[PDB]
Amino acid sequence: MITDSLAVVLQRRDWENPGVTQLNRLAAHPPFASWRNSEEARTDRPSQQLRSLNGEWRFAWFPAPEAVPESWLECDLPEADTVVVPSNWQMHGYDAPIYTNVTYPITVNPPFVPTENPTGCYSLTFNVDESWLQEGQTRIIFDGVNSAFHLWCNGRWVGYGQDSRLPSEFDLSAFLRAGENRLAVMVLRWSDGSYLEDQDMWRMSGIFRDVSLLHKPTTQISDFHVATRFNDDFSRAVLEAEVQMCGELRDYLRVTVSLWQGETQVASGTAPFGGEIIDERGGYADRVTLRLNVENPKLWSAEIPNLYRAVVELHTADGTLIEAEACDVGFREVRIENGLLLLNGKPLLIRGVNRHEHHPLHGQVMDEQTMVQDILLMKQNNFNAVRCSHYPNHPLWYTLCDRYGLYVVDEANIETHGMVPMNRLTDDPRWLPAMSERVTRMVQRDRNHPSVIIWSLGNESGHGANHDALYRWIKSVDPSRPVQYEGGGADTTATDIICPMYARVDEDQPFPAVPKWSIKKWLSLPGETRPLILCEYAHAMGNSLGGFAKYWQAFRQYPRLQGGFVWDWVDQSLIKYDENGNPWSAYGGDFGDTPNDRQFCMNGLVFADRTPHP
Amino acid sequence: DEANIETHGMVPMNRLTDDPRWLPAMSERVTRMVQRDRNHPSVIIWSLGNESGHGANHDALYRWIKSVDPSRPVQYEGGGADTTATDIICPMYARVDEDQPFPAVPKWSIKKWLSLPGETRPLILCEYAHAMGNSLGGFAKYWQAFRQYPRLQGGFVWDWVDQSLIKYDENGNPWSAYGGDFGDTPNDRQFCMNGLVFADRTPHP
Amino acid sequence: MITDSLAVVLQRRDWENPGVTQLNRLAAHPPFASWRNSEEARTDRPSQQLRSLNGEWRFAWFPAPEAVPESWLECDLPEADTVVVPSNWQMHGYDAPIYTNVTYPITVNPPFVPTENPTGCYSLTFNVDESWLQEGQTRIIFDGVNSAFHLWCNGRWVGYGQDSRLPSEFDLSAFLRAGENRLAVMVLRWSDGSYLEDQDMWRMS
Ligand SMILES: [Mg+2]
Ligand SMILES: [Mg+2]
């Protein structure tokens, strides 16, 4: 019909305009999946409401989005294969992936894209449950897409999304019906969001993470925050939690927050809705804040975990419960006082590594069995701090970085390392809305976890006014962690701890307008008090890590230096088969692309198997 | 000068400001002001908004003015007029000798503001001496304290011109109309004058 | 045609979504008006390039944006008066303006608006110069509209704007042609931008 024919969805193009970044999306929230009985919140058994949609799908490939036929949304075309999803369409043998270091693939001309976008068509037929259409809403969850995508449900239009790494969730309440249902998704290659991500990595595009479906009752809970505070002797502790609900309001609803450890319990609390007057008419009528207190805690550190367990549930006054969610919790406190990065009243010494998400066989897809070999092979070799570079990861990495013992540095999705000069798209304030939807929706996803201790804005994107604008927005809505930023010389107002890249130890080299002084010379300049943690040191391609012993004398003699991060952990290689069947590791631009850079894709501390370097 | 923000109806008055889903629509009314009015020699103080609560966004735009133009100060009123989003204190309707306490947003006395522990900034009033009907009584007591103390600076008077509308009878002679007499519901029926002169113009006493 | 029929401009509604605040707008700049010889910059004589379009226009009033007929953009309806522009349609005697102090006019429910928006239709026929279509671009400047508005040039679609007080400027380079030309503008009463302006004043549009 109209306007759900393909002649009217396409023009006017939404993937060329930086003022339209989304249509019909919901808010962000920490992941909870909403199981029903109160008992399984303590045991973390697999819930029955959360339903997964992995498996086999229908697929077809088109050279441009203007040549796709109109009869696709009615029934499936006879030319489709069967493709397992999640996967990229680059590795199956349709196109050739490209690799660059500093230059954009397409011609530089903002905000346009060329007229040959390789576009793809996915299709799926599924059955739905009978009772799910009677009451409540059924939320549909995409955890990954690259880069921009349109969606159709049963021959009608739903929405549109832009961002690549962070998830996207849609509402699908009144559309579907009993029995069988269709879903048709069209995926695009290049869009305006490609002008803000230019990391040193391979270039692939598709659906590469999980896809799931979820069910909620008509009254639900939406958000909740957990915060802790301490006295001076580390002997008495105060927990406070804030619970955000939604939907229909009544009077007789109650909440309950129970704190569990092992099998016994410690503290509990209930309260009804409403309170805490603020300026100046009234107070919030949808929130509650509960306070509990504990004696002699078991603290979280890098050496010993000592996790707790928390259950937050919503129930009536007699009464049967409706919802219960859970989040893990541990106790610590991070602060800067008099010029040292202090944790639990002790100075700290960081030794870490950068990690870049990659796999040789399946492309960008990460399974479960790889993330345990990474943490087990980091702990045995005396590391305790990992930096995710340069985008937020799968939502399961953090809880494996809770139970084992290492620190995590997190990052938004901004890099502009191609423009001339490198602060054109940042200082110009026409790009403030599209740039401030990649930092806000990170903090609301990753704020309950106990592992993250340092936020970071971006990397290699110059200096401007926007990086000063978002900085108070993190430092005004969460005051318990510091904020770090590198580019522009690593001295400016948009940071709190100095972080140069690739700074030497004794000699120094001057540049015009962005020097790199010596590491013992930074601290003695007139009017400088902050500490210094390196963001990148000791590049490691081929035979490298020479002169490494000279850093670890100065790291122990001086009081105020703190350590650094090592680039890089794992190689980025891809596999390819010959006529014999034997494989050989491929690198750079050998697939058949122009241009290329042909050696700067290894950066290896281990191989891609994994098997350790010397 | 001033941007275009007021949210004096919601419950509480920082719902649409603290929630960060409204940051793009709210940051297109301050940026496009500064690029229009920055060459003129008359404007000396920027101001963000009025009567819109306190939140994170009013801290977010503040460094954006103070990082692209450093030659003028920035002023903001709501929330108690003491917070981090301002540089000069500006309460509205603060008295001279007596004080009145409220929960969570007091209005202390004007000689008492400056002597609190850890306070150094000046004080320019944003609104004083409401002037509907016979008013401006007790006006002489402000202009003794404005000349004795060093660090007080003065204030702004609400309001200059009336807001009346005209309407014709069957005779042809006019009469000044006010409030909700056109035929609307609801209305407020006296708070539209606020006059220091009439609507002609012809001066009040 | 498609998509410049009125059945496809309206849904999906852009005046209910706080993520869409503009379509096809240019940057901001201090006002300069671009006269040609170097001598008149010192004397500030009236420039010849800057051309004003005040005067008389065609007008009609509709109770809701869903009942407007489709043959309006072809030729003008026979039921139009002649109205001098700039002016508000409240003072001519079509509706009744409203006044409040603290409460919103419509029912509080963000981000929606009710389904009876009083909408208006302006129309204008004008001649253009011959040499202006040969070289260079011809920028069109609106210095005020309340509140959200759509625009049509010669039966084709151009853009959409939201904000009330600050100006708005569009590009009109490749659309017009020699001789005579039409402009049809449709103005809306309430939109999402009404949830950020609540000053103590009269309510006109
Ligand atoms: Mg780079
Ligand atoms: Mg007010």
Residue numbers in the entry:
A (entry chain A): 2 to 615
B (entry chain D): 411 to 615
C (entry chain D): 2 to 206
Reported in the publication:
Here, we describe a new approach that we call specimen preparation on a tube-reconstruction of average subtracted tubular regions (SPOT-RASTR) that helps overcome the common challenges with cryo-EM preparations. In SPOT-RASTR, we sparsely bind His-tagged proteins of interest to the nanotubules and use the RASTR process to computationally erase the nanotube membrane leaving images of the protein of interest. Here, we demonstrated the efficacy of SPOT-RASTR using the 520 kDa protein β-galactosidase (β-gal). There are four β-gal monomers in each β-gal particle, thus a single β-gal molecule can crosslink multiple tubules.
To overcome this problem, we first applied the tubules to the Quantifoil grids, then β-gal was added to the preadhered tubules. Instead, it appeared that while the β-gal was tethered to the tubule by its C-terminal His-tag, it was still free to rotate around the His-tagged peptide, and thus a full 180° set of views of β-gal were achieved even with the particles that were bound to the edges of the tubules. The SPOT-RASTR particles were subjected to 3D single particle analysis in cryoSPARC, resulting in a 3.58 Å resolution map. No evidence of the lipid trace on the map was observed indicating that the tubule signal was successfully subtracted. When the Euler angle plot for the conventionally prepared data was compared against the SPOT-RASTR data, it revealed specimen preparation on the membrane tube filled in most of the missing angles in the Euler plot. However, in the SPOT-RASTR β-gal data there is nearly even angular coverage along the −π/2 elevation (bottom) compared to conventional plunge freezing where there are very few views along that axis. A slight decrease in overall resolution (∼0.5 Å) appears to be the trade-off for utilizing SPOT-RASTR compared to the general conventional preparation method for β-gal. The loss in resolution is most likely due to increased ice thickness due to the tubules stacking on top of each other. In the case of β-gal, it has a tendency to crosslink tubules due to having multiple His tags per protein.
